[PDB]
Design a protein around this ligand. Structure first.
Ligand SMILES: CN1CCN(c2cccc(N)c2)CC1
Length: 147
């Protein structure tokens, strides 16, 4: 019996089975196996032209499309997963959130405080686990649960 949130899938390019989480948008090859008052997370945000506030410390006027933002997110996830780059380094350089200055750290929080897709992903992640692309009214997030 798989844990809730998780489903079995089959690659497409290779035919090998993998597991996908529809709350975190994480995917992995191994069987996942398996809630607290509070969690601590970091994130990397890529905004797009339909973000609630299409502006950030990186760019006064953010004009990229949502599709372009998802491509950027997917590229950062690839480099993090390969070890070519660290999550903290990419967040500091490229997150459209002012938390970039703290390597993406948002600190600890409870349910009720964050936007719902962000909250649900954060609480479904295990400690140390990274999400896939998570969509909110702010943009597209990579979320790292640190505690
Ligand atoms: C929406 N953002 C506002 C800025 N934030 C921030 C800024 C500096 C350092 C840390 N840890 C967090 C919180 C999240």
């Amino acid at each position: 019996k798989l844990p809730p949130g998780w489903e079995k899938a089959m690659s497409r390019s290779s035919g090998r089975v993998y597991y996908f989480n529809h709350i975190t948008n994480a995917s992995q090859w191994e069987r996942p196996s398996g809630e607290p008052a509070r969690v601590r997370c970091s994130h990397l945000l890529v905004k797009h032209s339909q973000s609630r506030r299409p502006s950030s410390w990186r760019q006064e006027k953010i004009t990229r499309t949502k599709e372009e933002a998802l491509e950027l997110i997917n590229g950062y996830i690839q480099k993090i997963k390969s070890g070519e780059e660290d999550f903290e380094s990419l967040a500091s350089q490229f997150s459209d959130c002012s938390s970039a200055k703290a390597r993406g750290d948002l600190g600890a929080f409870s349910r009720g405080q964050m936007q719902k897709p962000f909250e649900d992903a954060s609480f479904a992640l295990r400690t140390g686990e990274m999400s896939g692309p998570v969509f909110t009214d702010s943009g597209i997030h990579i979320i790292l649960r640190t505690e």
